[PDB]
Design a binder for this molecule. Structure first.
Ligand SMILES: C[S@@+](CC[C@H](N)C(=O)[O-])C[C@H]1O[C@@H](n2cnc3c(N)ncnc32)[C@H](O)[C@@H]1O
Ligand SMILES: Cc1cccc2cc(C(=O)N[C@H]3CC[C@H](NC(=O)CCN)CC3)[nH]c12
Ligand SMILES: [Zn+2]
Ligand SMILES: [Zn+2]
Ligand SMILES: [Zn+2]
Length: 235
């Protein structure tokens, strides 16, 4: 099918044009941070020498205490500019494209090879309390929407990327996936991002195991094509 790049989403009227020809997904409002309907210490890594920075060595890598608790550092981190643990904030996203699938709608694929436990994208959207969430479920059912964009963030917080979000919203489900969600604390506030669970060759679709609690017996069928396909979306 047709494909497109994350920069294509920055030109609104051209996008809408590409959408008229079916060369891009339908329009949504692009945002770079979660938006709320309901109004809401440093680590101990030793500073790296300028020599160690030049050698290729990692600042706040795997032993960093902020990182081990999936907390990103701030500006006041000991390693300052060198800190590798500010990925959400610096928007250090993987190189991925938005493509048209056979039966799932649009999707995400890797433009380059991507290592294991590599950051893909933040799942951004409108954060909802339980009440707003239920309002929208019903509103969406009554508009006969086909695609749904809900992601559980925490107790009484669900991200809805139906109207406002970013390209994370195109990652499809798979019963045998190559990414997972991770919840990270940034400035005392929780966020969700997608991360590879294995190596993902260039061209391959990126998928995760969506486990949002299924309500009815009734569900969306799964066209993931795996050997182990559970048949439907949801947990
Ligand atoms: C967040 S969206 C993913 C983006 C969607 N493909 C689009 O075109 O906007 C989730 C929706 O994609 C579709 N979807 C995702 N994974 C799927 C799968 N494995 N089989 C069938 N539909 C899928 C479902 O309609 C679901 O409600
Ligand atoms: C981010 C992402 C990636 C891949 C798949 C999904 C599905 C969703 C999603 O929001 N699914 C919803 C469906 C409609 C349900 N409706 C009821 O349970 C009540 C009446 N059937 C709620 C869950 N989000 C996704
Ligand atoms: Zn650190
Ligand atoms: Zn740091
Ligand atoms: Zn499946």
């Amino acid at each position: 099918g047709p494909s497109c790049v994350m920069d294509d989403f920055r030109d609104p009227q051209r996008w809408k044009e590409c959408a008229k020809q079916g060369k891009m997904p339908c329009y949504f409002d692009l945002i770079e941070e979660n938006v709320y309907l309901t109004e809401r210490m440093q680590c101990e890594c030793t500073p790296l020498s300028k020599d160690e920075r030049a050698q290729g060595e990692i600042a706040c890598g795997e032993d960093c205490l902020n990182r081990l608790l999936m907390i990103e550092c701030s500006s006041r981190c000991p390693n300052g500019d060198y800190c590798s643990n500010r990925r959400f904030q610096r928007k250090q996203h993987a190189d991925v494209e938005v493509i048209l699938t056979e039966k799932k709608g649009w999707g995400l694929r890797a433009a380059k090879d991507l290592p294991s436990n590599t950051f893909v994208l933040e799942y951004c959207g409108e954060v909802l309390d339980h009440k707003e969430f239920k309002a929208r479920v019903k509103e969406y059912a009554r508009n006969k929407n086909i695609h749904y964009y809900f992601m559980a963030l925490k107790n009484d917080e669900i991200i809805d990327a139906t109207q406002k979000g970013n390209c994370s919203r195109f990652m499809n489900h798979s019963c045998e996936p190559n990414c997972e969600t991770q919840k990270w604390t940034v400035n005392g506030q929780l966020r969700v991002g997608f991360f590879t669970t294995k190596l993902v060759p260039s061209g391959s679709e990126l998928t995760f195991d969506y486990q949002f609690q299924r309500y009815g017996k009734e569900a969306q069928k799964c066209f993931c094509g795996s050997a182990n396909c559970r048949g439907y979306l949801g947990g």
